[PDB]
Design a protein around this ligand. Structure first.
Ligand SMILES: [Ca+2]
Ligand SMILES: [Ca+2]
Ligand SMILES: [Ca+2]
Ligand SMILES: [Ca+2]
Ligand SMILES: [Mg+2]
Ligand SMILES: [Mg+2]
Ligand SMILES: [Mg+2]
Ligand SMILES: [Mg+2]
Ligand SMILES: [Mg+2]
Ligand SMILES: [Mg+2]
Ligand SMILES: [Mg+2]
Ligand SMILES: [Mg+2]
Lengths: 299, 299, 299, 299
């Protein structure tokens, strides 16, 4: 039979799950400054946890933490967390143009005549780049939340066709389309620390130049055995339309972007003191800079 | 049993395969200069290997060899190559117009109101022409890579309807369409030499006026027995729209063109010296001129 | 149905295969200098890629790269390579002796009377040595290509029987025999760089003291989980024959050695620029020195 | 048929197995010094190989090596060893008390009236601690062999109930019970060196802060891929009994503890010299200090 003297055993490793969800408006043009070129593309870093745990303050559109992040921030920081899945779906595109003008007046923005204009989406699958800089080096987290920011992919690309000649992956987005991109985080470890407003924290992934760090008092755990499948962030630009006579149209578009992230947070132990054991297994996530773009290549 | 004194036999005729891929933007108008006529059409010489082995330099949009061609150029030149299949697919057409104007102002380019405008594509299947010249005789390889160039088909064709009355093959391309054209090269021989920037090198084909040349020290190998099926390059022009009262619209369009070519290159022999035997079987491909257009007719 | 706006996706990770083949003559004696001892043995480093990618210049018997290596050297260096399988087969042994002499004359070389003489082949399977030096420390790549070179295994081994008392693996080779030894390289990674004439580059293997290096900008990928099966190079010497009265015969032999290596080289990306992404995953192969011998022991 | 010239191949990697067995007496009290508190607990480090390879000298109860360890010490040190399984079984508890006293006299030790008193056994499964110190910092190996020693778990724990409120795992031991605890060592590697009298040598385990070291001339082999199941040592104290009026009983107990460890030792190679190859794969075991306690936490 049962042990009449069995003692209550405390739970170990139990956790909770929190889902983050939000919606945003994004606008895009041909990523040009004057005549079309192939120097920049808008970048959407889906791997940046910051884009999901933060939102915009209604009064000044500044970056502010979501109620959910705010309420579990302390627990995350101390006991650890994992990111299972996260992603975005862009849809409901609305094409725009600024080619109409009044006599002795300037061009004004309007809807487009038809639905022929489209957005171009790229991924560096052939291994062109390792590290890039934002066109503006003073970009803030708020800006990124407001919209994907421009990244210089080829400072010397006067030829606007460079992107379509170089990027391995390419697809178009037009009215009626739905474009979904997701990322699954590595779940072998628990990660510690908060997700600051100063630097992007990457959803746990291991490959190429990308790597997370070992615990303060513990061995590093990672996939050393083989090359993992690399994950690519996306780059975009409204397709730059040139006419047969060299005329360049002024087109752009606005889309709705729905975001989601599934977070799992570790619970504190039973008792009345903060433990210390987690120092042996809590890994430190990889981080970057608001004005930098790191592309993973495992092959 | 096996021969205890068998010696290692060296491989013979082994080769490697390289695929070339790229994407480009093309623009077209009614191929006119003032009032519509039927004198010129844009030509897309899919048989020109140069269009696949070269690309555009990002800094000045000049012709430059692709990394792939660059890395196998030497081997190709000396040991030989074959072209299996190559082609293009034009899609995502975006119709354009320059008929809108502001009071006391000129016409400006804009998207089109509807999707009714379309591109006309022709092939000389009935045997009208043998040799044509480009409208401009100083065209460069870079220009051809940038866009299909104009070719004079009927210097005396004041009547803009001449093309639709004369060309045996004709089809239209409009928004949503995909137009694919391919060519399969003759594979009975291996060909030598580089693909220069000065003159177009034709994908091996035999028929009519078109022919490749014999090896330096060897017999010519070709299909002498029968007439092969001729291959036609395409000619285009945005359909020239005239109104009931003689008004002529200013229409054009931009499309995306994806290119591919499958190349097979012969490997050098085992050992430490360049051989000489290939001189007996390496044929010389047919070549043309950047300002000329040769049409094949085997029947 | 299909997407009317699908774009061409570029190939990724495609590669080519190159096989290297050659034949050589090797000669061996009892590895002695005067009276027999057990200090040296000829070594055949099958793991040295240099032995397969290089050959001998016909004019001066110096080391020179094979046409095949020469034509892919640049691509290998920049985009990466792997070695699948490589090896040698020694056969057609011809026993020799220098025991016959003319009155008031010296000994002269001749064929042997019978086929009783034989070659001894060893492998250090019991873990005797880690690192050894060549008897002559000024050995060149050309010498190694010309013939297996002497390596000092026991500087204090006056007793010529030491090798047969110590080496764990041993087999004999005589007329009619075929002795094949192969090595399979690790294929989890791509490796960069050329194979110089100055230092031996090892076919990728991981174990014991042997290890390859991490990419410039990427994580190291290797089998950390377990001990791999170690690979042993071979050591030889014509069996030293002593008579009942201490007389020492002067025997040797010549064999034919056929070599082969299967190389796989990565192709450059589509486009007109050299990429940089490979810096994240191209590992650096292990290298040694022409006058050193490293033996692997994983158990 | 068989090769008439086949040579004897030497054995490789062969080994021998040695089992260690012993019995001891352990005594325990409430781990207090005056009034009950929750600052210390007796610790039994089953992972310390020293507890199995050493015993007590009959003349002075000092630590001395067992005949078995003594006879294989040299071989272990040089050629390597592994620990498969080891453990203890505590049984035959005899409860004690010192609450009886004579008029105008002090308390004297006696058996207990009934079998209600019991021992408490804990394991830090919830990750409370990483590193602890022994109550006395001058503890010797002999002391540990003589009995489990006190370790300070909470220097500020005046509240004697702290242990039962904090430790995740807890069970009781009373008359008639048998408490068995075992540990299985990692067997992927061979380990070298002796097991000194100065510092505890841990049975090979990898996880959290715990790790073994790489060979002198070889790659480190360990489970990097995932978090292993951590192993916990035990902590004890006779249950501190307080009466309804605050009276504190003086209880304790004595048990018999049977120990065992299965060791596998590698044999030297055939021949007449000590080899050197083992330097490439013999790992170095993790070690600690006689006055320290390291707790593993992999999650
Ligand atoms: Ca916005
Ligand atoms: Ca163009
Ligand atoms: Ca030779
Ligand atoms: Ca005792
Ligand atoms: Mg605009
Ligand atoms: Mg980044
Ligand atoms: Mg126009
Ligand atoms: Mg032509
Ligand atoms: Mg001789
Ligand atoms: Mg070596
Ligand atoms: Mg007592
Ligand atoms: Mg310890």
């Amino acid at each position: 039979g049962p042990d009449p003297h069995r003692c209550l055993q405390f739970n170990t490793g139990d956790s909770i799950h929190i889902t983050f969800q939000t919606r945003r408006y994004f606008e895009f043009d041909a990523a040009n400054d004057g005549n079309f070129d192939g120097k920049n593309l808008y970048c959407l870093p889906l791997h940046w946890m910051n884009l999901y745990l933060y939102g915009l303050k209604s009064s000044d559109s500044s970056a502010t933490e979501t109620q959910r992040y705010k309420m579990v921030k302390s627990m995350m920081k101390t006991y650890g967390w994992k990111v299972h899945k996260a992603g975005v779906v862009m849809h409901s595109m609305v094409p725009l143009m600024k080619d109409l003008k009044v006599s002795g007046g300037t061009s004004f923005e309007t809807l487009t005549f038809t639905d022929t204009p489209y957005l171009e989406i790229f991924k560096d699958t052939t291994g062109l780049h390792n590290q890039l800089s934002t066109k503006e080096t003073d970009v803030t987290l708020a800006k990124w939340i407001q919209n994907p920011q421009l990244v210089t992919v080829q400072s010397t690309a006067a030829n606007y066709e460079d992107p379509i000649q170089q990027f391995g992956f390419m697809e178009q987005m037009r009215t009626g389309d739905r474009k979904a991109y997701t990322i699954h985080g590595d779940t072998r470890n628990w990660y510690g620390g908060e997700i600051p407003t100063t630097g992007p924290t990457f959803i746990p992934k291991w490959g190429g130049q990308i790597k997370w760090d070992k615990p303060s008092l513990g061995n590093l755990v990672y996939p050393a055995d083989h090359h993992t499948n690399d994950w690519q962030q996306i780059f975009m630009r409204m397709s730059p339309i040139k006419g047969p006579n060299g005329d360049e149209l002024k087109l752009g578009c606005r889309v709705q972007a729905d975001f989601f992230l599934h977070l799992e947070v570790r619970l504190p132990p039973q008792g009345c003191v903060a433990s210390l054991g987690m120092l042996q297994y809590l890994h430190a996530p990889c981080t970057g800079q608001l004005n930098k773009c790191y592309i993973m290549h495992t092959n």
